[PDB]
Homo-oligomer: 166 residues x 3
Amino acid sequence: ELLEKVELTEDNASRLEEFSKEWKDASDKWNAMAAVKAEQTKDGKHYVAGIGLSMEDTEEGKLSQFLVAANRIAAIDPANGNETPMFVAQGNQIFMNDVFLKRLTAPTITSGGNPPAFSLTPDGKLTAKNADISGSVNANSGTLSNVTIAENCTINGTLRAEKIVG
Amino acid sequence: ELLEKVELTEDNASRLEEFSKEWKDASDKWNAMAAVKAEQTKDGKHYVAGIGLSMEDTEEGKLSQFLVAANRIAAIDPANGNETPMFVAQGNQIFMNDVFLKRLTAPTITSGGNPPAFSLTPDGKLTAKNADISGSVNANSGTLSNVTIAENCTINGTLRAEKIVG
Amino acid sequence: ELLEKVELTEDNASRLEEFSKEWKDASDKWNAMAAVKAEQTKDGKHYVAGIGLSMEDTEEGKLSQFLVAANRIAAIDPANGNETPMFVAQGNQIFMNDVFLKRLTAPTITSGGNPPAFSLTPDGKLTAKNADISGSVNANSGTLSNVTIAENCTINGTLRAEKIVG
């Protein structure tokens, strides 16, 4: 029964080279994705470029963090199994919901529809159903219907009506 | 020494068997990871969805692009012990900083105020405390207290004043 | 000669020592990433922490899904062949393109040009150039240069017209 162990020794030696080849392939593949994703470099010297998912602990406690320095994004929302992209590089396009603001700069503003009612052209035009002023008004031209007056009415230029009664 | 080399044979063989078992289990687990999570190999550039960073040379030089054809995200600020999510996937959640704009289409616009003030409502309404105009006007109603008729005026409808100077 | 096969067993033993070294090293690394980034363990129901691209089966077929607990992204557009620092997400700023709107809140609004030709301020003023109103107007203090008065006008206050024609 000597014949057994040596055949075994072979059943071993023969399997080791092939396993070595497989593990070498795996190690090379890890060398690939490591420079891709898992650089396994523990430092803040290169901003941890690539990708990182640090479950970092402070004196506060465990706090999650995900670090990527490459934007290169093109997203789609999955809600209801939907397939709508949202970040074409032309500065977002889904819709603007309720937004708080303190600085805006826009030439064109539209009320809505084949025709907007109250609009704000870059030319400075404005259509409205009201103009309430609690202060100064400097008007230049005008085609006006009713001007109800009961307070100071002093004139420096010209006035020419059709009927003047009083 | 009698059995030492012989026993090493079976010890090896058994250790290889178990080592191969754990390797097969783990390798199947990896086979499961890139199958769904990102991809691997040298997959062509047709759809290549999943997590992947590639450093391709350009005219300027390297380009480490990071591709994500994927879905809803939510992120928080980890700043030195901060825990407040800000833009967590609710369709432009909180607010915009200094922003330039081009065009819009909106029913309702306000100011934003505690004991508060002016707004641009869907129905043209505006209480603008200083409505300076340097061009044409088409008014169909108005109540003017202190009239400063500066240049040549005219009336098509009628004027009727209790007072008169001239 | 024969001593090669006997030597073969102990050579295999040393080779297994080396392979066990490397393999348990790698497995320990992956186990470290498991709660960090690998997420080898299952999630169950809704609990989820970390990363993973799950292409779940649905009655309609494929449903890829991605989930991030918390992150902070950099700013490089697809912009192949160009470096584009866009969407830094600093100070909650992205830059907005053409878009609709439903609800707005902005005390400060500009004309979308080098100066603000028409401006909205927390003071509530408006230096426009045309404001036509088909409804109510309440202008307290104002001047009128080239105006035609197309409907009724009544004064209960003082009247100091420059001239009267009729």
